[PDB]
Amino acid sequence: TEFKAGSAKKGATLFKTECLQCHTVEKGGPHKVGPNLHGIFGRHSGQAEGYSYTDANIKKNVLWDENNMSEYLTNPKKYIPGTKMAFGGLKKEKDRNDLITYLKKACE
Ligand SMILES: O=S(=O)(O)c1cc2c(O)c(c1)Cc1cc(S(=O)(=O)O)cc(c1O)Cc1cc(S(=O)(=O)O)cc(c1O)Cc1cc(S(=O)(=O)O)cc(c1O)C2
Ligand code: HEC
């Protein structure tokens, strides 16, 4: 996939409805069902401090960027077979661009 910067405003609403139940974004924010996402961009998969990941999420062995994030969020278990993230994915390209535009700001 090829990320294109979109609307963080639309992305924020998508995060609220699709992601917030399992994830926080703020620095020092708590783990929930899923890990806190602060600092996710640039970091090795499966490496937030204090969170117990699947071996699949750890050993995916990629650094997160906007393009592999878009691919992941299209269909999480297809990109990371073995994942325990129970999210079906955002099939729509604009949704992923907007979400990721938001995530870049919100987890900085
Ligand atoms: O910046 S905005 O988010 O306000 C914006 C709103 C509209 C827009 O048409 C665009 C931006 C331009 C635009 C950008 C992109 S992107 O490169 O992926 O960022 C894609 C499109 C687009 O028109 C094409 C498009 C895709 C989809 S998808 O099926 O979800 O992938 C839906 C739409 C698209 O126009 C419809 C649409 C939704 C929305 S929504 O408010 O975000 O739901 C605003 C506008 C729309 O035309 C009206
Ligand atoms: C129902 C729960 C749930 C939902 C909904 C969910 N997630 Fe997750 N997410 C998780 C869990 C659990 C993990 C850890 C999975 C593992 O260890 O295999 C995870 C992992 C991730 C990771 C990898 C983190 C890392 O450090 O490698 C990212 C990125 C992520 N989620 C983003 C999102 C985004 C963005 C959304 C919404 C679009 C979302 N998630 C929706 C539960 C969820």
From Swiss-Prot:
> What is its induction?
By oxygen at the level of transcription. Expression drops rapidly when the oxygen concentration falls below 0.5 uM O(2).
Q: Which cofactor does it need?
A: heme c
Residue positions of the PTM N6,N6,N6-trimethyllysine?
Answer: 77-78
Q: How is it modified after translation?
A: Methylation may enhance its transport into mitochondria. Methylation occurs in fungi, plants, and some protozoa, but not in animals. The precise role of methylation at Lys-78 is unknown, but it seems to preclude pro-apoptotic activity, possibly by lowering affinity for APAF1.
CC cofactor note = Binds 1 heme c group covalently per subunit.
Q: Which GO terms describe its cellular component?
A: mitochondrial intermembrane space; mitochondrion
Chief localization: mitochondrion
Specify whether Heme is a keyword of the entry: yes
Task: Enumerate the residues binding heme c.
Answer: 19, 22-23, 85
Question: Single GO molecular-function term?
Answer: electron transfer activity
Swiss-Prot/TrEMBL keywords: Electron transport, Heme, Iron, Metal-binding, Methylation, Mitochondrion, Respiratory chain, Transport
Q: Where in the cell is it found?
A: Mitochondrion intermembrane space
Q: Which GO terms describe its biological process?
A: mitochondrial electron transport, cytochrome c to oxygen; mitochondrial electron transport, ubiquinol to cytochrome c
InterPro entries in the record: Cyt_c-like_dom, Cyt_c-like_dom_sf, Cyt_c_1A/1B
Q: Name one Pfam family in it.
A: Cytochrom_C
The answer to whether keyword Mitochondrion applies is: yes
Q: What else is known?
A: Present with 7330 molecules/cell in log phase SD medium.
PANTHER family reported for this sequence: CYTOCHROME C
According to its UniProt entry, the function of this protein is described as: Electron carrier protein. The oxidized form of the cytochrome c heme group can accept an electron from the heme group of the cytochrome c1 subunit of ubiquinol-cytochrome c oxidoreductase. Cytochrome c then transfers this electron to the dinuclear copper A center (CU(A)) of the COX2 subunit of cytochrome oxidase, the final protein carrier in the mitochondrial electron-transport chain. Isoform 1 (CYC1) is the predominant cytochrome c during aerobic/normoxic growth.
Similarity section: Belongs to the cytochrome c family.
Q: Which protein are we looking at?
A: Cytochrome c isoform 1
